Design a protein around this nucleic acid. Sequence first.
DNA 1: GAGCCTAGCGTCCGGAATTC
DNA 2: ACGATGGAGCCGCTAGGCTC
DNA 3: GCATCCCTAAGCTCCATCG
DNA 4: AATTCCGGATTAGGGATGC
Length: 390
Amino acid sequence: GVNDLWQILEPVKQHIPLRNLGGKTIAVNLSLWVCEAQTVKKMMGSVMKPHLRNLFFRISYLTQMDVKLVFVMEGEPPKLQTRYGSSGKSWSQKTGRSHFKSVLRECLHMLECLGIPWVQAAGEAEAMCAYLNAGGHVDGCLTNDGDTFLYGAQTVYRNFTMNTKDPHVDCYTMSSIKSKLGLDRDALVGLAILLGCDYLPKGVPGVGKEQALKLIQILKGQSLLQRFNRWNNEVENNIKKKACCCEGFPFHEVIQEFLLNKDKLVKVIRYQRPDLLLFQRFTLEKMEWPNHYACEKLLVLLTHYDMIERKLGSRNSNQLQPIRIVKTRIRNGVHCFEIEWEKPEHYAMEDKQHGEFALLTIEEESLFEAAYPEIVAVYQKQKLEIKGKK
DNA sequence: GAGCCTAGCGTCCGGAATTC
DNA sequence: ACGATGGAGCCGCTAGGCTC
DNA sequence: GCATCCCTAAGCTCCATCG
DNA sequence: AATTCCGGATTAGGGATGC
Ligand SMILES: [Mg+2]
């Protein structure tokens, strides 16, 4: 968490709407989402836990945008005693941390119900995100604020929001940082050194406004030049650097903390079909969702998963079967079909007599045609029949 | 933060401020 | 017959107030 | 009978009642 | 300097009132 680093990286950031993330895989810092949900203050009298709710609806929206996800489960930080409130040990602090971990466990449970993979990070989640990105396992890393670039990530997405107007993420690519700003990974690390990180809150003595001028000065290397100083215009910025030298270079250990990679993968990242029964059970006992409501909310994820599998070329009997195409529709400028489906196993209906009429979705024409070309074919046949009739 | 539920709009064109 | 003017319902989008 | 002045709507799509 | 707005302008109807 460098002070003012995002401001430094602002000229490179690009406003990217969420729909434009289709076909991309993103690692998600689950902890940041859970804390963000904890920050909600509106529902004072009825503060139902929005950690699970926001997680689910974000997952649903991104899934409908053809965005696959893998969630990173935070581990233990490597480094942390003033015998005050400042020390993390305290009943309210400890028990609160236990509650946070419990919420994380529940979120993991819902991820398993949805069939979405989650990995285990050794330490900070950001490190595992950058590990997935650098390893080609994901296309981007989603974080409101973090040192993901310092852990070696190439692409970072920021400021996620689902506002009806302007759903977007601010994108930061490493290549455009090295080209437009001329900042390599080591340059970012050293910038985090003089400006301070989540480990070091101090931005002083270096003002930081002239550190960019130092980066303009030297083009070859960054950290090595901080190294020769231990053996030790230019004299003046080096004088402020001397004000940093009286500190004694305690941040070297932080450097090697950023550069060392401890994260590993135990199992291949895999996606499974959402479990309708397990999802009804979980949402019922954890969020007090009626079974019919949980089914109604999960239907779009079931249809999306099955359509994806059929497009991949694998078809099984357990997949959902469309009864018919009702009519063509348009959703946010996208051409879609209104699909009436057949009632799947363990699906709960609100209306006893008409629930089977109620089973309905709206799917993108492209993906639905890839999944059920026969259904699309008979619909287009009926359209040829109406145009031929008149 | 996101969803749910309700309401109401729905023309063309050009100067305008400064890219939802 | 005919088809034409209705007209009521619906559709897609946006906004506001309240709920989970 | 026709003119004047002001206000308001302005999407699409079936069916249906009417000349 | 360029691409979103919104304020004014269109066109057509309807109603109340005036010649
Ligand atoms: Mg973390």
